[PDB]
């Protein structure tokens, strides 16, 4: 009798993986090179942002830790894109790097099913194309039914500061892993190399708080976790805004031809290069903890020579006397081409071997965590012999991410920010639980008191929308309100509640003004979530139906997975630039085929009147 799943690496993918395997009721072994460093935040002292916020909430909705961890460890909470719509609202908080990592370990150590081991994996062994065991530095083999690899930037890592380069997996402070990459190539795996940068850290006390403008967390912040109740008290530090000078840019041009991130997006070098017309660039100074002196210089990711970096930083207003604790650097690492893995996070070359995280050439904690979660769930499912889970592009940002990963192949690590997923309103942060909670249940990650509670919150919204049409509102109550708001004047018999609250009126502006409505529905009053959902469902009726119709169109397309071993030289009126892109790329699903820039909308129509 041995282990079920052994998860290598206890970073962001590794944790969500090991936690999912354990909470899924299977014996799990977490192997990692350094326990002092579980879930360490190597780069940004923050979680969330444009696409990252949504994907974090979706991790929470499925029963993952990252959501809870940031609510537990936040330093300033700030929602991005406030003036924009529900689809644009993006949750983001600063983390206490060290306190975040401690929390994540604490959780992993309190889960009975996870045994821990501090060693480095230098090889994975496999018999006739299916996983068997894993070789640690000592040369032991450790036997398991299925293994998740979550190695981040450690596989033959190299640190680049200007022209010199040192061994190092995350920072110079970490030894790189050396055995494993050759061992995997030995099992028929192709691999490339990626570079990603981190900005320098500076001593807070060396900053001129007379010039730099302070940016506090917003009054009444938003919790990532649907289980959390408040994060009001978690507004402990604020961040600090500045911009760069034309004079900063001159200093940095010096080192361009030395920095191994300069290209032809991940640089300040690259930024000034691709945009020499903007005479300014934003930088955010972010404390890394509530009482550390270490400060992260956002938007200044760099590989310039150590001496040029300080010269640049000091030119930035507010940082004339900046003391630099670490230089910014780039990490070069081995990654495994994302076509080699399935949508299910399982690998093609070997069954029961899953890849999650930076190792798939993605970048981001949230991005890595989401993969770890799925890879974890699916490792349990495989051992049980149950159905593996793939999320749809109409279901989650995670679905879009994992699909885009295995599909879109490019020389740069995949970030979700440039990902302008046209499915926006239906995938907004605030309904993630409704969408994914049931899927969470099937994987033993969401409690019944949770699952059943989300099943009832949807019942109330639609039950309320019943009343929002019947309910009537006389021009006696709202006319004086509308006079001041300068909105639509109610000359007449407008009731049809929905027809009122659309152009710029709150749902609560009505319940407050008519006895009619609150009598028919005061349940939304008592619950603030229903109130929030209903108010959007009707204020965005038009656009939701429009988006959902396309999502179903795209759902139907992604639901024809049978195009494989058939003559691409059978189709009648195709090609001339299509057909050649089809034979080159070889699309798995016909939905995947409609995103190749070579094929036309008219070409995929002739592939449908076929399959």
Ligand X SMILES: Cc1cc2nc3c(=O)[nH]c(=O)nc-3n(C[C@H](O)[C@H](O)[C@H](O)COP(=O)(O)OP(=O)(O)OC[C@H]3O[C@@H](n4cnc5c(N)ncnc54)[C@H](O)[C@@H]3O)c2cc1C
Q: Going by DSSP bridges, is the β-strand pair 294-298/158-161 parallel, antiparallel, or unpaired?
A: unpaired
Measured between alpha carbons, how far is 478 from 430 in angstroms, rounded to an integer?
A: 29
Closest CB 15 distance from ligand X, rounded Å: 8
Closest CB 328 distance from ligand X, rounded Å: 10
Measured between alpha carbons, how far is 374 from 384 in angstroms, rounded to an integer?
A: 15
Q: Which is nearer to ligand X, 309 or 454 (CB)?
A: 309
Task: Judge whether 101 is annotated as a binding position.
Answer: no
Task: Judge whether 77 is annotated as a binding position.
Answer: no
H and E: helices and strands count for the chain: 22, 20
Task: Judge whether 266 is annotated as a binding position.
Answer: yes
Quick check: helix, strand or coil at residue 51?
helix
Q: Which is nearer to ligand X, 255 or 413 (CB)?
A: 413
How is residue 188 annotated by DSSP? T
Task: Judge whether 138 is annotated as a binding position.
Answer: no
Q: Which is nearer to a copy of itself, 307 or 489 (CB)?
A: 307
Q: Which is nearer to ligand X, 414 or 441 (CB)?
A: 414
Token duo for residue 610: 């076929």
Three-state SS for 436-471 is HHHHHHHCCCCCHHHHHHHHHHHHHHHHHHHHHHHC
How is residue 346 annotated by DSSP? B
- Residue 43's binding partner out of ligand X, a copy of itself, none, with CB under 5 to 8 Å set by partner kind: ligand X
Contacts to a copy of itself from residues 322-381, by CB under 8 A: 323-326
Q: Does 273 bind a copy of itself (CB under 8 A)?
A: no
Binding site for ligand X (CB under 6 A): 8-14, 31-34, 37, 40, 42-44, 49, 52, 120-121, 150-154, 170, 177, 180, 196-198, 266, 301, 357-358, 363-366, 368
Measured between alpha carbons, how far is 101 from 41 in angstroms, rounded to an integer?
A: 7
Q: Which is nearer to ligand X, 29 or 180 (CB)?
A: 180
For 217, residues 6+ apart whose C-beta sits below 8 A from its C-beta are 76, 77, 78, 93, 94, 235, 238
Task: Judge whether 267 is annotated as a binding position.
Answer: yes
Closest CB 463 distance from ligand X, rounded Å: 38
Of the candidate residues 130, 140, 278, 459, the single one contacting a copy of itself (CB under 8 A): 140
Task: Judge whether 270 is annotated as a binding position.
Answer: yes
Q: Which is nearer to a copy of itself, 258 or 502 (CB)?
A: 258
Q: Which is nearer to ligand X, 153 or 575 (CB)?
A: 153
**Strand ranges inside 65-161, DSSP E:** 74-80, 90-95, 114-117, 121-127, 130-136, 141-149, 158-161
CA separation, residue 254 to residues 323, 327, 574 (Å)? 21, 17, 52
Q: What is the CA radius of gyration of the chain?
A: 26
DSSP H/E element including 202: strand 201-203
Contacts to a copy of itself from residues 202-231, by CB under 8 A: 203, 205
Q: Which is nearer to ligand X, 8 or 319 (CB)?
A: 8
- Residue 100's binding partner out of ligand X, a copy of itself, none, with CB under 5 to 8 Å set by partner kind: none
Size of the site for a copy of itself (CB under 8 A): 44
The CA-based angle 224-400-263, given to 5 degrees, is: 95
Contacts to a copy of itself from residues 279-308, by CB under 8 A: 291-294, 306-307
- Residue 293's binding partner out of a copy of itself, ligand X, none, with CB under 5 to 8 Å set by partner kind: a copy of itself
SS3 percent helix, strand, coil of the chain, rounded to 5, is: 40, 20, 40
Of the candidate residues 13, 39, 79, 161, the single one contacting a copy of itself (CB under 8 A): 161
Of the candidate residues 25, 82, 84, 118, the single one contacting a copy of itself (CB under 8 A): 118
Token duo for residue 523: 């349940």
Q: Which is nearer to a copy of itself, 171 or 273 (CB)?
A: 171
End-to-end CA distance of the chain, in Å?
47
Measured between alpha carbons, how far is 511 from 572 in angstroms, rounded to an integer?
A: 61
Closest CB 152 distance from a copy of itself, rounded Å: 15
Task: Judge whether 183 is annotated as a binding position.
Answer: no
For 322, residues 6+ apart whose C-beta sits below 8 A from its C-beta are 202, 203, 206, 207, 310, 313, 314, 316
Closest CB 420 distance from ligand X, rounded Å: 16
Q: Applying CB under 8 A, which residues contact a copy of itself?
A: 33-37, 40, 98, 102, 105-106, 109-110, 112, 115-118, 120, 137-138, 140, 161, 164, 166-168, 171-175, 201, 203, 205, 291-294, 306-307, 323-326
User: What residue numbers does the annotated binding site cover?
Assistant: 9-14, 121, 265-275, 358
User: What residue numbers does the annotated binding site for FAD cover?
Assistant: 9-14, 121, 358
């Amino acid at each position: 009798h041995m282990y079920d799943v052994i998860v290598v690496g206890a970073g962001h993918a590794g944790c969500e993986a090991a936690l999912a395997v354990a909470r899924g009721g299977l014996h799990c072994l977490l192997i990692t090179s350094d326990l002092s460093a579980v879930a360490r935040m190597s780069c940004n002292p923050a979680i969330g942002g444009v696409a990252k916020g949504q994907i974090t909430r979706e991790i929470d909705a499925l029963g993952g830790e990252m959501g809870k961890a940031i609510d537990a460890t936040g330093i300033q909470f700030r929602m991005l894109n406030r003036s924009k719509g529900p689809a644009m609202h993006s949750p983001r908080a600063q983390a206490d790097k060290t306190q975040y990592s401690l929390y994540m370990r604490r959780i992993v150590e309190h889960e009975p099913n996870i045994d821990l081991l501090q060693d480095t994996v230098i090889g994975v062994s496999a018999n006739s194309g299916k996983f068997s065991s894993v070789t640690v530095r000592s040369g032991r083999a450790i036997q398991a039914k299925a293994a998740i690899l979550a190695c981040g930037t450690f596989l033959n890592g190299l640190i680049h500061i200007g022209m010199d380069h040192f061994p190092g997996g995350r920072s110079t402070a970490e030894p790189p892993v050396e055995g494993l990459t050759e061992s995997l190539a030995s099992l028929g795996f192709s691999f490339g190399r990626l570079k990603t940068g981190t900005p320098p850290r500076i001593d807070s006390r060396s900053v001129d708080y007379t010039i730099v403008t302070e940016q506090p967390g917003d009054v009444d912040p938003v919790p990532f976790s649907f289980s959390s109740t408040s994060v009001a008290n978690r507004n402990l530090v604020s961040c600090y805004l500045t911009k760069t000078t034309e004079k900063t840019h001159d200093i940095l041009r010096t080192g361009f031809d030395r920095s191994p991130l300069f290209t032809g997006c991940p640089s300040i070098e690259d930024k000034i290069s691709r945009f020499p017309d903007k005479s300014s660039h934003h930088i955010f100074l972010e404390p890394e903890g509530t009482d550390t002196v270490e400060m992260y210089v956002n938007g200044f990711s760099t590989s310039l020579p150590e001496d040029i970096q300080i010269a640049g930083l000091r030119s930035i207003p507010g940082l004339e006397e900046a003391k630099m604790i670490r230089p910014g650097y780039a990490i070069e690492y081995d990654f495994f081409h994302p076509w080699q893995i399935r949508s299910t996070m399982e690998t093609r070359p070997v069954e029961n071997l899953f890849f999650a995280g930076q190792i798939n050439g993605t970048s981001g904690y949230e991005e890595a965590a989401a993969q770890g979660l799925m890879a974890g769930i699916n490792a349990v499912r495989k051992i049980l012999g149950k159905e593996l889970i793939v999320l749809g592009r109409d279901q989650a940002y995670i679905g879009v991410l994992i699909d885009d990963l295995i599909t879109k192949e490019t020389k740069e690590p995949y970030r979700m920010f440039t990902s302008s997923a046209e499915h926006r309103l239906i995938l907004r942060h605030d309904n993630a639980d409704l969408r994914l909670r049931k899927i969470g249940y099937d994987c033993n990650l969401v409690s019944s008191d949770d699952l059943h509670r989300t099943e009832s919150i949807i019942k109330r919204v639609q039950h309320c929308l019943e009343v929002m049409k019947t309910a009537k509102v006389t021009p006696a109550e709202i006319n004086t309100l509308l006079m001041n708001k300068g909105l639509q004047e109610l000359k007449t018999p407008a009731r049809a509640l929905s027809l009122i609250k659309r152009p710029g009126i709150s749902l609560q502006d009505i319940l407050e003004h008519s006895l009619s409505v609150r009598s028919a529905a005061e349940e939304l009053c008592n619950d603030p979530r229903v109130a929030e959902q209903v108010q959007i469902e009707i204020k965005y009726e038009g656009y939701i139906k429009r988006e959902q119709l396309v999502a179903d169109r795209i759902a139907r397309l992604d639901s024809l997975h049978i195009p494989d071993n058939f003559n691409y030289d059978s189709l009648n009126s195709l090609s001339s630039e299509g057909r050649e892109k089809l034979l080159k790329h070889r699309p798995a699903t016909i939905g995947q085929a409609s995103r190749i820039l070579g094929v036309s909308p008219s070409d995929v129509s002739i592939l449908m009147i076929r399959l």
